[PDB]
Design a protein around this ligand. Structure first.
Ligand SMILES: Nc1nc2c(ncn2[C@@H]2O[C@H](COP(=O)(O)OP(=O)(O)OP(=O)(O)O)[C@@H](O)[C@H]2O)c(=O)[nH]1
Ligand SMILES: Nc1ncnc2c1ncn2[C@@H]1O[C@H](COP(=O)(O)OP(=O)(O)CP(=O)(O)O)[C@@H](O)[C@H]1O
Ligand SMILES: Nc1nc2c(ncn2[C@@H]2O[C@H](COP(=O)(O)OP(=O)(O)O)[C@@H](O)[C@H]2O)c(=O)[nH]1
Ligand SMILES: CCCCc1ccc2[nH]c(NC(=O)OC)nc2c1
Ligand SMILES: [Ca+2]
Ligand SMILES: [Mg+2]
Ligand SMILES: [Mg+2]
Ligand SMILES: [Mg+2]
Lengths: 438, 426, 338, 54
């Protein structure tokens, strides 16, 4: 067994962090106080859930998690919420005054004064690890902390833990649920400086989650709570292989070898089905073929884009619930006949499948109905580059006028980092285009 | 968390007083300083503007400055006059005579250190000071000349804190003396340099609104200040109540100010109400009115420029889905007056608690290049006198030189060219 | 009031569509790069499909189907036909064609000689204005040094008087619901020079492009204005001369071809459940042989209309493709059903 | 369509299905740049403070 440390950064990272750890507890039978009656190996364990929880001699199961925000409001709701007891006070790190949606403030000015403290609270968790795999890093692109401090943290983790894997869950900015305007700046800056430090990154566009919430959950105006409970369902289906018995995606290194052959192109698309409203009075349960087919509908992706006009480098199906291999293969066969699934020439056309018999756990009183079977598809398709094209274009429009640049220069960034970051993204967009179009 | 408020001069103290009345009623604080409200949402951000004091009363983080005692004795006598910390009343005796030079260089300099001692005492009790707000006029002597001297000294002592002003702009329709364009032009350069946000409250627009629209035949300063206190309440709703965003002054400035000198905002309010109606506005009505020129407190035509950024804050119980559609309706309907190179530059927030006496309201904050019309107007009035050196002796008598006027006029015209550069851009 | 953008200034068709939209008083035109549009009439090359459908509160429509170029460029059309089971390698209405780079070159020459030792005609054309026909394989393989080589149709239907060759251009609008609409008025692009089976490198007799005929051919405008015969005259000719109609002898085949080409790529390009929506106007080019059999030549993705029909067709693009999506305050199309 | 590497346990199974075969900076460099930005920030503030001194 090998342990995994989860790092939640900024408002978005912290609140998604809370949604997941809540879900993790409900899935593993861990109560809000940290007790797990089913764990008969008290005070320790080699088990699969122990990759995410430590055990105290008092039988308390404690997330391998650190929360960091440059401002206290959001982490203070961790400190006082249903899961107060779960967390060691030393795992919740807050500053005084936030990064004001300013990457430079998060990376240079405010980040420099708190990086060593964070690395020290991370090192205290790493020291309780017999064999640490690495890190799962949750954060927004658009926030000043989520972007600025995260990239600084990622740089230092690469020097301090050189051979460990680092995975990201990254919230990509959507105007519908954001009051900022400089988020294109922060996203490009944090992507450029984090790229070579991240082995695998799952992007979630708030636009896609918002619309899934509206269309499939009949929520008229989704809140962050709606968004995050849905997000944490996806994250949980992605990490379940790290926390349960099985043979697929069993360590962090496997995510990269299974999903990222070319290391710069390390942004797999997530697609999730089915999302069903808990207030739907009568629901006809969906079959294996219907939910697997739904993995190829753009309306169910974490990033709205069109995979028919790209090429696949890898594809993984993660089913939870009543599913057997024969029904998966029967669904796949009918789907290749009717869908445009084109792999790159240097990769086999095929699917790595993992099945967990336990159906999705849902948060009591959430918006998601229970379902007998669900699937999360992870596909590394070049079509996700559409999201880089959108963001870069927004960056180009503002930067051509140097709109808002003075805010970054005034925190110690040089103008030339903007264009160095933007040109890295231009390299990235062309890498995708080489790999994926003829 | 904490904002420190400063009010300078007659105008600064009269609107400042009404601002504290209005928001003290919104947070349930009475003239005693006693919280006597019903919802704990009134208290959750009470510390932004109030200190908790002896007896668990709430005391405004407010400093009251004048060069003459008149208006401040009438504040202490006013409705909420006892709510203020008596130590925070800082006044001279000799007045400023509507003379920027007296406020900035002679009489005001005598008094300014005294004011900074009070500012320091209020900041040191601040867990994490966000910044400062100043109420003042630009047309007189104290609020204009000493106000901007204060702002310079505050920037020297706290160069990493936000400075925002609510700045009343002079107009011949509401005019105390002929030298207002002189005082305003000298002040506008101070503001260009040392302010993060300036709300340009034009006494022309306030007058026109009271007259043309509230059908007030002869508006008083009280008519005008009712609009100002209602707008200041709306502009600060963000910071005083728990809502969707958690944005401090810096974050608000970050998303409104693309260029450091272009930080002069046109405020607006809907529905427009006189001191003494029962039909609530529909969300389409709130939205249309807040973008209507006649609801703008800076007498500029928004169709004569382009919006760099817009913020809007809706107050009351309402459908944010309907807000979303109406906000997106008025943009996608008129995208010709928003710059195309700042994507998604119109931002909206809702707060459930409405102001006193309305079930629905909307505050508009526009960063439009049309604000150049205000500065051109002041500049034309400035040069009409300055090309004859008229009334200059009042200033040279306090040590100023004509050259300082030549520089101020020329800085003002530069500011105007800057706005015109972006009104034609892409 | 709806908004639109115009990113292809040189399109005859949508130039007229833009002017019709404004005249309704309910459409306003924005500048090229304003992203708050309802409708985009986009560039022909590198159109940014990835940026569409991400503006909150705006339904967005574009006049191009992403992916439809596979139908509309010579080499990809052949690859699409031979490799798609819906249009088999055994496809009765496409000329035997070959993709040769400066690959199937060795595959092709096996076809040459079984016909050459089989006592059959062996005239071929090479395509990609740089277009050459001959019965020498050496000829064009020499000249190619991507291109396409396909059998020249050595017995075309020839109109009289004139003994002249022709091709048929059909205009097809596919709306956002993937309804396939064939415009009732086609056009027949004729040669004014008579046809001759020996002098292949007298190509003004063998290639019926409107450009060649106007100033590279001797007798242009002789028989009909424009070298353009519309459907009513062509129909009367087939009645008077061949004792049949345009509908029975040719249009049935044309409709079958259009529907089968478009139904084939539908899963690849449909926008049914996408966050933005497409329509597109295609120009289909047919050759008719002397047995009244129709052959598809090539599909044009950005076609120009014939001058008499602009008004009626562009008004039908607004009605069926644009106001179907953005409503305002008998049809000229045949709906091909699937 | 061949089913490969099937592994079963009591919580679930995994396998692959194939349809077709194929055709860093140092600690010192980081702290250098974090301190370069801080002196750019201390220089710009000294410029303001001198400007305020004139
Ligand atoms: N999905 C989701 N997105 C969020 C959440 N909170 C904030 N965001 C998004 O993240 C972006 C804003 O960044 P934040 O995470 O709030 O900022 P931060 O990391 O705290 O950095 P600063 O507050 O600037 O110091 C916007 O696009 C928000 O819409 C959340 O709880 N869930
Ligand atoms: N296989 C074939 N057999 C006989 N004639 C052919 C032929 N292929 C092409 N032609 C003739 O060649 C002409 C031009 O062919 P092609 O379709 O390649 O040109 P083009 O792309 O310019 C037409 P468009 O303007 O509609 O795109 C046709 O009008 C037809 O007369
Ligand atoms: N809106 C408004 N304007 C005022 C008020 N009092 C004065 N003014 C304007 O302020 C300018 C005179 O400044 P004033 O505050 O009286 O001078 P000071 O006390 O020396 O700062 C003129 O433009 C007046 O019209 C007021 O209560 N409300
Ligand atoms: C999402 C909508 C944002 C609304 C908004 C935007 C900018 C602001 N700046 C100030 N400043 C202030 O109140 O000074 C005392 N308030 C603001 C409110
Ligand atoms: Ca155990
Ligand atoms: Mg934050
Ligand atoms: Mg006065
Ligand atoms: Mg062509």
């Amino acid at each position: 067994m090998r342990e995994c440390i989860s790092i939640h950064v900024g408002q978005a990272g912290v609140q998604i962090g809370n949604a997941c750890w809540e879900l993790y507890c409900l899935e593993h039978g861990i109560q809000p106080d940290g007790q797990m009656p089913s764990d008969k190996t008290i005070g320790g364990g080699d088990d699969s859930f122990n990759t995410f929880f430590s055990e105290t001699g008092a039988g308390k199961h404690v997330p391998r998690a650190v929360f960091v925000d440059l401002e206290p409001t959001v982490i203070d709701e961790v400190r006082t919420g249903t899961y107060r007891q779960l967390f060691h006070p030393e795992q919740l790190i807050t500053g005084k005054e936030d990064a004001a949606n300013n990457y430079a403030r998060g990376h240079y000015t405010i980040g420099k004064e708190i990086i060593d403290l964070v690395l020290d609270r991370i090192r205290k968790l790493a020291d309780q690890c017999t064999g640490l795999q690495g890190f799962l890093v949750f954060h927004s692109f658009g926030g000043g902390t989520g972007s600025g401090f995260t990239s600084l943290l990622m740089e230092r983790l690469s020097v301090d833990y050189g051979k460990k894997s680092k995975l990201e869950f990254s919230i990509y900015p959507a105007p519908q649920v954001s009051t900022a305007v400089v988020e294109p700046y922060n996203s490009i800056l944090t992507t450029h400086t984090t790229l070579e430090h991240s082995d695998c990154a799952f992007m979630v566009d708030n636009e896609a989650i918002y619309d899934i919430c509206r269309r499939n959950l009949d929520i008229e105006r989704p809140t962050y709570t709606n968004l995050n409970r849905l997000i944490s369902q996806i994250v949980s289906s992605i990490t379940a292989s790290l926390r349960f018995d099985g043979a697929l995606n069993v360590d962090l290194t496997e995510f990269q070898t299974n999903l990222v052959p070319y290391p710069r192109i390390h942004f797999p698309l997530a697609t999730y089905a089915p999302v069903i409203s808990a207030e739907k009075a009568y629901h006809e349960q969906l079959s294996v073929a219907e939910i697997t087919n739904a993995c190829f509908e753009p309306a169910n992706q974490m990033v709205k884009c069109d995979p028919r006009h790209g090429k696949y480098m890898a594809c993984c199906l993660l089913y939870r619930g009543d599913v057997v291999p024969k029904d998966v293969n029967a669904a796949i066969a009918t789907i290749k006949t009717k869908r445009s699934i084109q792999f790159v020439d240097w990769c086999p056309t095929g699917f790595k499948v993992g099945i967990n018999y336990q159906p999705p756990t849902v948060v009591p009183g959430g918006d998601l109905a229970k379902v007998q079977r669900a699937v999360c598809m992870l596909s590394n398709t070049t079509a996700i580059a559409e999201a880089w094209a959108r963001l870069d274009h927004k960056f180009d429009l503002m930067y051509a006028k140097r709109a808002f640049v003075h805010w970054y220069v005034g925190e110690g960034m040089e103008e030339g980092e903007f264009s160095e970051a933007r040109e890295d993204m231009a390299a990235l967009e062309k890498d995708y285009e080489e790999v994926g179009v003829d | 968390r904490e904002i420190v408020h400063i009010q300078a001069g007659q105008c600064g103290n009269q609107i400042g007083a009404k601002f504290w009345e209005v928001i003290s009623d919104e947070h349930g604080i009475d003239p005693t300083g006693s919280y006597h409200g019903d919802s704990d949402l009134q208290l959750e951000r009470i510390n932004v503007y109030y200190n908790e004091a002896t007896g668990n009363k709430y005391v405004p983080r407010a400093i009251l400055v004048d060069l003459e005692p008149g208006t401040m004795d009438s504040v202490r006598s006013g409705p909420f006059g006892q709510i203020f910390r008596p130590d925070n009343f800082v006044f001279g005796q000799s007045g400023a005579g509507n003379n920027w030079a007296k406020g900035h260089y002679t009489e005001g300099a005598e008094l300014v250190d005294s004011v900074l001692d009070v500012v320091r005492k209020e900041s040191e009790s601040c867990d994490c000071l966000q910044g400062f707000q100043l109420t003042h006029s630009l047309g007189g002597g104290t609020g204009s000349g000493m106000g901007t001297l204060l702002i310079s000294k505050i920037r020297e002592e706290y160069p990493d804190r936000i400075m925002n002003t609510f700045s009343v702009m002079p107009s011949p329709k509401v005019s105390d003396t002929v030298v207002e364009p002189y005082n305003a032009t000298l002040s506008v350069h101070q503001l260009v340099e040392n302010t993060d946000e300036t709300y340009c409250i034009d006494n022309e627009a306030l007058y026109d609104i009271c007259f043309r629209t509230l059908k007030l035949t002869t508006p008083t300063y009280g008519d005008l200040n009712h609009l100002v206190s209602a707008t200041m309440s709306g502009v600060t709703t963000c910071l005083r109540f728990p809502g969707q965003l958690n944005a401090d002054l810096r974050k608000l400035a970050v998303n409104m100010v693309p260029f450091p000198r272009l930080h002069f905002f046109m405020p607006g309010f809907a529905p427009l109400t006189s001191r003494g109606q029962y039909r609530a506005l529909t969300v389409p009505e709130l939205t249309q009115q807040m973008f209507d020129s006649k609801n703008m407190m800076a007498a500029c035509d928004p169709r004569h420029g382009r919006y760099l950024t817009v913020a809007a804050i809706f107050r009351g119980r309402m459908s944010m889905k309907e807000v979303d559609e109406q906000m997106l309706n008025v943009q996608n309907k008129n995208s010709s007056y928003f710059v195309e190179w700042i994507p998604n530059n119109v931002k909206t927030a809702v707060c459930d608690i409405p102001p006193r006496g309305l079930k629905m309201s909307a505050t508009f904050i526009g960063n439009s290049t049309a604000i150049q019309e205000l500065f051109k107007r002041i500049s034309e009035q400035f040069t009409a006198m300055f090309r004859r050196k008229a009334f200059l002796h009042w200033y040279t008598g306090e040590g100023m030189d004509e050259m300082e006027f030549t520089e101020a006029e020329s800085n003002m015209n530069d500011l105007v060219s800057e706005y015109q550069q972006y009104q034609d851009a892409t | 009031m709806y908004t639109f953008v115009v990113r292809d200034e040189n399109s005859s068709v949508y130039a007229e569509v833009s002017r019709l939209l404004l005249a309704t008083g309910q459409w306003k035109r924005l500048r090229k790069d304003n992203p708050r549009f309802n409708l985009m009439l986009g560039e022909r090359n590198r159109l940014p499909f990835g940026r569409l459908g991400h503006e909150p509160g705006l339904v967005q429509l574009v006049n191009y189907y992403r992916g439809a170029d596979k139908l509309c460029r010579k080499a990809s059309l052949v690859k699409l036909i031979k490799t798609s089971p819906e249009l088999s390698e055994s496809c009765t209405w496409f000329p035997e064609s070959y993709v040769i780079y400066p690959d199937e070159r060795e595959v092709f020459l096996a076809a040459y000689n079984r016909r050459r030792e089989g006592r059959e005609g062996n005239v071929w054309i090479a395509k990609s204005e740089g277009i050459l026909i001959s019965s020498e394989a050496s000829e064009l393989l020499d000249f190619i040094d991507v291109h396409v080589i396909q059998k020249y149709l050595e017995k075309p239907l020839l109109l009289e008087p004139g003994h002249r060759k022709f091709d048929i251009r059909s205009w097809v609008l596919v709306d956002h619901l993937y309804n396939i609409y064939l415009y009732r008025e086609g056009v027949l692009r004729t040669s004014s020079e008579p046809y001759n089976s020996a002098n292949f490198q007298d190509k003004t007799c063998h290639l019926t492009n409107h450009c060649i005929q106007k100033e590279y051919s001797k007798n242009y405008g002789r028989y009909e204005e424009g070298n353009e015969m519309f459907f009513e005259e062509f129909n009367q000719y087939l009645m008077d001369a061949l004792n049949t109609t345009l509908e029975n002898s040719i249009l049935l085949q044309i409709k079958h071809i259009i529907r089968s080409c478009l139904m084939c790529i539908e899963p690849a390009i449909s926008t049914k459940h996408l966050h933005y929506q497409s329509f597109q106007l295609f120009g289909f080019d047919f050759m008719v042989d002397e047995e009244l059999k129709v052959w598809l030549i090539e599909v044009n993705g950005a076609p120009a209309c014939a001058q008499k029909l602009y008004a009626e067709l562009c008004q039908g693009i607004v009605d069926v493709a644009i106001s179907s999506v953005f409503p305002l305050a008998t049809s000229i199309f045949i709906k091909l059903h699937h | 369509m061949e089913v490969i590497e099937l592994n079963k346990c009591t919580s679930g199974q995994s396998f692959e299905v194939i349809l077709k075969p194929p055709s860093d900076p140092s600690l010192e460099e980081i702290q250098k740049k974090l301190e370069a930005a801080e002196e750019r920030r201390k220089y710009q503030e000294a410029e303001l403070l001198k400007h305020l001194a004139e």
